[PDB]
Amino acid sequence: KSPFSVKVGLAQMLRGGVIMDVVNAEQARIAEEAGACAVMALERVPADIRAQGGVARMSDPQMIKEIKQAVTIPVMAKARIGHFVEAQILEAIGIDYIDESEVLTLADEDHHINKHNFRIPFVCGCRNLGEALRRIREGAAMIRTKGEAGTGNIIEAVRHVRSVNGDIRVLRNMDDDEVFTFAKKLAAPYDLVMQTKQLGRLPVVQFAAGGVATPADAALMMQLGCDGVFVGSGIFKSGDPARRARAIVQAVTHYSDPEMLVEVSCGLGEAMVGIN
Amino acid sequence: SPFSVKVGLAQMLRGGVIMDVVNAEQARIAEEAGACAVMALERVPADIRAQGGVARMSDPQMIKEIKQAVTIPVMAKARIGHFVEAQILEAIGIDYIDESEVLTLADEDHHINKHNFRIPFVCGCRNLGEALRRIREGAAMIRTKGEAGTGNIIEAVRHVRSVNGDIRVLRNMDDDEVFTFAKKLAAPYDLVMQTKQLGRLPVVQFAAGGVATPADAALMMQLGCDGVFVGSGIFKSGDPARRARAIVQAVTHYSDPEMLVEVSCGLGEAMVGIN
Amino acid sequence: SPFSVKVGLAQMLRGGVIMDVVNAEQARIAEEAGACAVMALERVPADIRAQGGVARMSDPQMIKEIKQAVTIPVMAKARIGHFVEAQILEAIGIDYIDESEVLTLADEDHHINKHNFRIPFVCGCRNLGEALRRIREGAAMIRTKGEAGTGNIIEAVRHVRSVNGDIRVLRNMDDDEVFTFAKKLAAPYDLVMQTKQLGRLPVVQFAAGGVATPADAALMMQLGCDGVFVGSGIFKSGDPARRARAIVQAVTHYSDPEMLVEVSCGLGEAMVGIN
Amino acid sequence: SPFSVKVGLAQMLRGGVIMDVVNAEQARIAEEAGACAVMALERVPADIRAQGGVARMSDPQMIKEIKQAVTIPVMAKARIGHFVEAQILEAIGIDYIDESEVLTLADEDHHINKHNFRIPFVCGCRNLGEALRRIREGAAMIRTKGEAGTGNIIEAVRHVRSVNGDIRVLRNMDDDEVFTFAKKLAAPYDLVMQTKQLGRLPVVQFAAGGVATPADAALMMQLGCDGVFVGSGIFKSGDPARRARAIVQAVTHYSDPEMLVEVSCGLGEAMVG
Amino acid sequence: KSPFSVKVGLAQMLRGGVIMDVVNAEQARIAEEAGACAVMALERVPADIRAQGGVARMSDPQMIKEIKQAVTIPVMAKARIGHFVEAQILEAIGIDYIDESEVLTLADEDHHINKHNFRIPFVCGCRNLGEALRRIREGAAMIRTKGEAGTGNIIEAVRHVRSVNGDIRVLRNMDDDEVFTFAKKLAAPYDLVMQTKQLGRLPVVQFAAGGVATPADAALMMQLGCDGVFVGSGIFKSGDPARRARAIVQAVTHYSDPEMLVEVSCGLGEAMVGIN
């Protein structure tokens, strides 16, 4: 019944899905046709931001509108961390989600966007449970790992998923009397720590993000417990984007089916090169 | 709510002096002087400091004796984290438990889950974040820690100014910056916001630690405290009953320098203390 | 006082964008875009940063050409501490001098004694103490320093939040603590108290440094600034005249997301900048 | 009344010795020796230093006894930051409050807002910036801190030379450099400029801390002080009443070596320190 | 009446003047025609010494003689610090001043030239009052700041002028009894410290030098209290040497006239690029 619960419910519709970064309408159509649950509209994917440098900002509303016109699935877009006016603009465009993203150039070193001031749901990144809960308290309706975006290397995403999931599991059997100190150690709001304890999971949808390059990577994130995956660079920086996009979608939908994972991985073409 | 009931109970002590007492006779002296409550304990902080050893919850027998000797509320101390000492104190029927750093720490990592009790708790603090963490654990009343048993108010002044200063910072603070402020304070965001909304601590806030003279006590009141604890400064002084009354009068009339002069004049030796 | 007249004069710039311009055509573009003033200089900060060398007061000839091309006020930069550069700029008859850290520092230890001048000065700052020190030296207007020429607003945000945050802290502070606060700021106490009483900086306060997009400009306004400087972000972008208008409109309509969408839509490539 | 009234009041003490006294008899001795004021306190700095413990405002009763025993102004000490001790002292009707580092610090971060009081305050300093910060808070009179209770003038000499030296530097400084000088001093620019224009401290400036002998006192005056405090040097010495008169004479006649010889000759044992 | 006083008096004839580094007779004539009070004859200006590296020494006497023949104003030339034989040669050429210069390659790390052994007046550089007085005690009849030569950046010259001038001002009101310790702190001869105190200024002419690139720079040095300015690189490394040379001369002669400073700065062409 609360406005936040409605936002949380909206993000829950993306469960089981792949969200694909797209830089134009053609890629948006490829993503939707491959079965993406949503597209992330942006002018440069993380691998290109990482390689090219320069300040990375909110994308031009015109290019976001073109992508939004080109698909029927939900459209997300990125705002710089702390750049609440970029978020105001994105919301006024009429898109479905805002990603307050560390992949763009940090705009406010000390504060994130007060996301409760918006009608549109936000996704935020995290490396650990305390960070996830702090973003949620600011009003994020959806959490993803940060991983190491644009590297094609899942090691940090695995670290982040295992960190969040591990500390959630720690909460299950924890002495209630020890949770106050745990919340302090996490620098997380105690009421959200307690809610996570009661739920046995994050109070919002939890996606894997950062470095997902192969169907195996994506199914690994789902088997670790994520609700879905972002793929920013691994699809359209690969040798066969449309096929790999479908492959990753199938891997997320059928993550427990090794026969399917073989089938969609077989002859998939060159994955993104990435950085170790 | 049960917590708000406990918070209301502690609010009845506003404007008051709570005096540490080690026997029924000191308790009677405290009540006759106008203390709003007594803190029943076997040793006052100055003596705990000088003597060393492990300091624990006092014998229930001596607490009951003090409780029987007065009609004002009776508090007693439990070691930090020692929730069974608190269970015993509650079962004695006293009015408040001070989860006290003056006693020997029992749990280095956790305080008592005070929400598990019907009796209101007092907790100490040095800053706003610590106050709010104690309140989240269920403290219905907050005092500064100061430096107990030294007769030196410098640390209590620091803690009062720290808590009060950060509360004032909250008032005009950009709402969007409060999340980071709560993180910096390691404090529950919701209690930080409640504090911002109230413009004061969400529970009664007493000065404690080193209050030795009427001037000290009135200083704490002018700094904004709701009351003061005096642990050592009365009965370690040369004229306990007179100093007890003088400090009570100083807290009741903290803005009246003529009264502060009168009650301080010819008061006898304060406690020696330590610098 | 003469200082209060200069301070009063700068109030007309509230709600405005000041644009760095390197020739008369750019100055005309700026004015036609609705700039409240132009900053005449031979090289914008992004170019100074990229090229290195010593960056000085611009040739009076090119400043006069820009002054003759526009009817809005014209500012020009002097190196920090270079009071003779400022004497020259004043004798040109421009409207403001920006004693600017973007030019090469000329005096590592002292700024210009701006009270010696009839022309009002703008100075940069990173925090409230710096702002108040510049004001005491005679700055009639303050801007953040940000990170000039990078197209990255992160440092400007830091500076705006620092100045505004300390003003908000100061507003509510115990009067008795303001002496120590002034010491900690290394700022003149009387100016600190005037800032406390006003609840804002005693002079016009602009954002500056890295403002690259309409969203950036409106963000500075929503944080509480009176206006913005744009040095590099307009004429180092793909469509300067359009971006110039968009940033002006963003500052005018900073609380209108529908207008911010409109002016940002199809704006062309922003300056690439440096992270 | 404005701050300038308090500043003008304190100017009456110029040329004087202020003597710490612990009872009415010493107060009489001090006044009869020619003290310009007495500092009423339960224990002098040498004893506070030696005995330790928390040192606080003295009992109003003993302060009143001293105030009744003498006609010269009576000062008393409040702990730094202890504005309620100052309220009590003011309500006693004494003439000056010394917000004194010799007592136990009560507020590590803030001094008393002395402009909130009608009675003038004395504060200590070790350098010009400190003096100006105390003045801006409302001190109507400045003394050096020295190293109180030691009978050793070396720190007081340091503090006097520091304050006087920086005032002299300030007097001739390029006006354009004064902004940075005020920042370096962490001092209010306006008071810095007032000091520059006046050419001396804007309030009476006394030496204090360790003044043990007539030679000590005369040295402080020759360095340029307006007067001297003597807390422990007189009554912790062999013959207090004679040393009290000798130090008063030394301050009144600080440029006369023949007088300094006379008053120092056979003066008895100074404080050991 | 003393030989040193005569040397000091000779340098005082340069008050109000600009001294210009020149590398040939044509530049010498430009400098004189622009109104320089003297020329500094040298094979390479500081900006070129700084850029090119290599050991920088006394210039060939032949090129110094050619410059001396080409002008009627006094001619100075540089000797390496400590290179008293270079100074002997320069004196025997018949030039008017020797600059024992840090711009040339140091020849003696521990000792300067004993300048009292010469009939010709010396100029020496300094960063602070103690250094100035030490050079004077060795026999320098003229002092300049060192600044940062060849950079076109006046910040260090401003530092040096303010340091020397500041400590001279400190002397005015200083307790006489404190001057012994002040002289020790300055590592300066006490008698020269006392003389500076009595004069209220340096006992010799005091010029600004190092990084003076514009008329504004030069007038700034004069307003700070200097008696004149050296310009080594800022004139002939600029876009219009003869015009800038005149402009700087006028700025020094009329340093308190902002209308004149505007006039001579207007359309002056590109200043030397220099180094930050």
Curated annotation (Swiss-Prot), chains A, E:
GO terms for biological process: amino acid metabolic process; chlorophyll metabolic process; hyperosmotic salinity response; pyridoxal phosphate biosynthetic process; response to lipid hydroperoxide; response to non-ionic osmotic stress; response to oxidative stress; response to salt stress. Disruption phenotype: Plants have a lower leaf carotenoid and chlorophyll a and b content, and are impaired both in root cell division and in root cell elongation. Mutant rsr4-1 can be complemented by the addition of any of the vitamin B6 vitamers, except pyridoxal 5'-phosphate. It comes from Arabidopsis thaliana (Mouse-ear cress). Induction: Not induced by cold, salt, drought or UV stress, or by abscisic acid or jasmonic acid. It is found in: Cytoplasm; Cell membrane; Membrane. One of its GO terms (molecular function) is protein homodimerization activity. It is an enzyme of class 4 (lyase). Catalyzes the formation of pyridoxal 5'-phosphate from ribose 5-phosphate (RBP), glyceraldehyde 3-phosphate (G3P) and ammonia. The ammonia is provided by PDX2. Can also use ribulose 5-phosphate and dihydroxyacetone phosphate as substrates, resulting from enzyme-catalyzed isomerization of RBP and G3P, respectively. Also plays an indirect role in resistance to singlet oxygen-generating photosensitizers. Its EC number is 4.3.3.6. It catalyses: aldehydo-D-ribose 5-phosphate + D-glyceraldehyde 3-phosphate + L-glutamine = pyridoxal 5'-phosphate + L-glutamate + phosphate + 3 H2O + H(+). NCBIfam families: PRK04180.1, pyridoxal 5'-phosphate synthase lyase subunit PdxS. Vitamin B6 is an essential quencher of singlet oxygen in plants, that can protect cellular membranes from lipid peroxidation. Belongs to the PdxS/SNZ family. The active site is at residue 78. This is Pyridoxal 5'-phosphate synthase subunit PDX1.3. Homodimer or heterodimer with PDX1.1 or PDX1.2. Interacts with PDX2. Pathway: Cofactor biosynthesis; pyridoxal 5'-phosphate biosynthesis. D-glyceraldehyde 3-phosphate binds at residue 162.
